[PDB]
Amino acid sequence: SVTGRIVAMASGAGRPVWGPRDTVSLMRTGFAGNPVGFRSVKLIAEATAAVPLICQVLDLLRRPNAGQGRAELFEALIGQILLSGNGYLEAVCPEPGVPRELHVLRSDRMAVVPGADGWPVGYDYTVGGRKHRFDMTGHPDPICHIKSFHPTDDHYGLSPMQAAAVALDVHNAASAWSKALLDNAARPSGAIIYKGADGQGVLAPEQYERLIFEMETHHQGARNAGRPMLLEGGLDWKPMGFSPSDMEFHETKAAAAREIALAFGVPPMLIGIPGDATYANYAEANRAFYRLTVLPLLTRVSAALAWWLSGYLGAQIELKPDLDQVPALAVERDQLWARIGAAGFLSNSEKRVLLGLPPT
Amino acid sequence: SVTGRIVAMASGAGRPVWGPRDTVSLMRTGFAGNPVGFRSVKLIAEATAAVPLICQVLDLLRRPNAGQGRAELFEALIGQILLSGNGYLEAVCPEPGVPRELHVLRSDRMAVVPGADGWPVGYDYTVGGRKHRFDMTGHPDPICHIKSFHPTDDHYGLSPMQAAAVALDVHNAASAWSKALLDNAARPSGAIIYKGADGQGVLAPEQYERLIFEMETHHQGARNAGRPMLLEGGLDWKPMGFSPSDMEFHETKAAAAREIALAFGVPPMLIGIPGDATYANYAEANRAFYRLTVLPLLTRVSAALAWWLSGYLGAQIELKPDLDQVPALAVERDQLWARIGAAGFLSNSEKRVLLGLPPT
Amino acid sequence: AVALDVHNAASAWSKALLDNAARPSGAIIYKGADGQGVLAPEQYERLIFEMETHHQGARNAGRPMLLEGGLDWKPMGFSPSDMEFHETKAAAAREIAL
Amino acid sequence: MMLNEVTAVPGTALPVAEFRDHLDAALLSYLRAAIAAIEGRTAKALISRGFRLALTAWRWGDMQTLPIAPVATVTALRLVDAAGVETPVAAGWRLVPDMARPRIEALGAMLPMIPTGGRVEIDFTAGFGASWSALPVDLAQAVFLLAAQYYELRHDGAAAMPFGVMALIERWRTVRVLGGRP
Amino acid sequence: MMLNEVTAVPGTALPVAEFRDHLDAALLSYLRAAIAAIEGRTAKALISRGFRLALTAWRWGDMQTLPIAPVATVTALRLVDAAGVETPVAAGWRLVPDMARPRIEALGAMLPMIPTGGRVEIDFTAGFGASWSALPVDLAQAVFLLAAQYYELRHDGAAAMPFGVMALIERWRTVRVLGGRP
Amino acid sequence: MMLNEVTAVPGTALPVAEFRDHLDAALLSYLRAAIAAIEGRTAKALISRGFRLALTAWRWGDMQTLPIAPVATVTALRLVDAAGVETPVAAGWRLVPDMARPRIEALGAMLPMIPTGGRVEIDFTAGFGASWSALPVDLAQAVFLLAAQYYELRHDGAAAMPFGVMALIERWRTVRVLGGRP
């Protein structure tokens, strides 16, 4: 905090330090552009929104605003923390306490103003040509800013897409390579070379209509595959090929698809990347998914929500995921019960407390 | 909501902000065009409509309108949320409370008018040249707009087909490549080169009818495979080949088919894409299907229906999927019963409550 | 000490192979009317434009590239692509751990 | 795309005296038989006549480069109808004077839309100069090296100097590497 | 990109006397027919005339190297508008005098932005020297070896000495290995 | 990198008498047309004139080898500014006299930093000797074998002796095997 005095002014005191930028270009060619980046964010965002949260805020969280609900709020929120590394949550509060509505303002239309020392003084929602200038000089601080870990930036976070920015281009360009290879590529099945009496000479239109007819009727099609094609003097048929047919940037596009899923943290088994079986049977692939890139991301967003909403209600509320009621950790849930259930040295009163059950 | 004042006018106050467009071009060449995109939507839409919904609306949902039923309503509804990312549900209501009919208006013939601040003021159903201008300045708000998560758009959703828009073209064009390769391709089994006494010279019609006869009768067909074909002076037979025969854009079409299924979220085992076995025996492939792309999609549409229909009846109704009566989660259902059934430290009264059974 | 040098040098071999290596996808050979002759700047700007706009990129993979008299396109390759000192660097990594 | 010229070179501009000094109705007959041969291989004009590129459909919406290379001051861009309305439009395009791609692009929009059946005809003044003294002297020497050959041998008999007829016009030909869609 | 010269070489600068001694209206006609042939193969100027590179769009923002190689003292960089405003700008660029890449780069920023349709025209004085005695003598010998050939044979007939016309100008041609995007 | 010489060879140093004995305004015209041809193939100077290597950016920080090979006694290393400050610096470099890589390296540090736009110009005296009697006699014989050829045939006609013009200057050419970055 003490260094906040010298870093804020050196970054621009009281002036909008906008986002790293391109935060909207990559959203179109990295999310709405390719299926791997689309399915990766969609897989993480809907899984994070589906995990129940416990309250050691609810009524508000279940029904955030008149539009999106609890599911769509977290999806649209995590969908920003993944696409840009920044998550903003506006709260309007006509009456003191739990604010009425929570809105997920899109992160590419939002800039931070560092202010005087350290912590920002406000936020600027800039759509079109107009701003709004939220205010951070209060106790509620209506904007909650969830940042992914950024090592070199001081006011924003890092997007996992930014790391995979090259793999998304390799995947987009190799997919457009195969498509363009089909749209503009002249593959002839042969050629009727007609040199003529001279070294070079065309054939009259009376000979063209005859030749174009005997080729269309008798030598083209599936029903004409093998006609011996008498070639007179001067005429010739050179059968042409198509040397590279399959697999144009096939593995370099597959390796690129694996590096996009690698950056976002999803195991390639879940989204469907064809590749080596690192996990066995989706029992561990889903368990590793919810353990390495879903709950660690949720335990941060939920922790930021709790500390921000507890600034409105007069309490220091805690809000963590409910690791019990998740179907992805059932493989871990039962092996715990098997260890403590088969343990007879302690009585039933002791193991009910070990497994999280209220004693009887 | 506060930023809704500046974003609505900057997007056009009170004017129809039509759909992203192409929402009808891709429906013809991505759903009615190829089997992978057709089977993917059809698989998700009929599975989502088959899941029972619980009411912690029914009579209405089971018999929506005089035409389509509960099954066809959700299929035609999810079939739009998948094809365009937008789902509209019109409700006509002669008497107060539960509206008589629910209609799924196709999303490419519907546009949103943002209005003054934030939330829209109506919707425009534009068929042919005529509009209707629904009205959103009421409590019932007759149109329920289900949107898939769109990060950069403010009034619509994102279609999983839009992400796979290139993979659908690669699949369509590579399939039309193989078809056109069969319709117009001159494959001769040989050629009878007749140079003649000169460097070049045709053979008289008296020699053509003789040659065309001895080739048809004695040298063509399956019953004539090997005739030694005496070649006189000047005549010659050049056996021609067909170098690339199989597998023209074979793997690039297969990889494209896998990326369409990847975007829609179906495991390639279910629809039938030949590829690596990421899942084992359809017990986990179907369970992962209903867990990653069916129930997460249903728990949003059902949640939007509940909050919209509860605006008609005087209650805040909840409407969620019935995860018990689904055959796809039986593999997960029994492993729960095995863990709590084999747990003897707690009595039968405790485990009946743990498994969701009313005690006795 | 030697396995560390083989591992360091083979890793710097792959890196330097990417930093300074001219891989062209082809070449537009223009001999001309003579045995050798350049093409005027009016023909260069035209040729540099039709190649950039219509024949380069992923969206331009297959354009049939009409070649007039004198012009020619020689598609060039890249013969050793993968695995430059691949196993000798892997065997070196195994001898360091050994 | 027709590209039929309006008025030919009168002949008082062709260098019959200079050609005669290089070595008159026959001399004039071989000068233009060598100009047409060279300007057909290089797609040039060399005397700045007036042409009429009367085509029916634009290849692009910001294009339709002109076939004859050295162009200056497109006179009119007429839009006839199916009956021949012959209405001259005056705005919507601009000539980009280039020796490589002499094109008539646009004014920030599409070309003047062509009536169905109502071909567009463009008339321009394409060439190097009005008098022979304005040509690139290497292209003028190539016309002489060719015309003096047509004059010295009357039928197709046989004989490659360092800078011959070919090596002199090899730098005026059009270099194209597209036989594709755009 | 037009690059049409302003004023030709008057002829009082070309060495008609020295060419005659090497072996007059015909001699002058073969000297310039050999200068144009050699300066079209080497992209040089050799007499330092005045040119006008009137292009419409910069290829870079710190570039637009000039086609003619030996350049000195760009006179003006005019920016016309769509109507021909002909406003001369005076700052924002600098000529980097090189025999390899004669370029007019920048002043720490982009080139003077070109008005839409308002082509930029640059006029410069490119060449070796104003008098024939300033040329590289090997390039001057190549002009003589070629002009003396145009003089001794009038039509394209056939006959490679150690340092011929080609071996002398082979070191003045432009060496380029880019047919790509940048 | 310009490398335009300051003063040419006056001609009183070229061996017009010895060339005439080997076989005068024409003889002098073929001697220098053969010196320029040979010193352009070997990148030598042969008469030790004065040059001006006026470049804009060093290729290294301890380098900028000079193009002309036989160099001695770089006179000055001027650093102009954007306006032409023409301030001569006197320390910071040293010429390494080599026939292979005649370079002006450094004094234990970087070259004198070049002002932005303020090109550096170096003037040196590169060559074998001031008089013709100081040349390597095999390079002097090559000039005679070439000049005597330019004299005996005036246009590019055709005729490889054991030690010809090529075999004599093949050991004075620059041997380079780098077309890369450094």
TrEMBL record, chain C:
<protein>
    <submittedName>
        <fullName>Putative gene transfer agent portal protein</fullName>
    </submittedName>
</protein>
TrEMBL record, chains D, E, F:
<protein>
    <recommendedName>
        <fullName>Gene transfer agent protein</fullName>
    </recommendedName>
</protein>
<dbReference type="InterPro" id="IPR011738">
    <property type="entry name" value="Phage_CHP"/>
</dbReference>
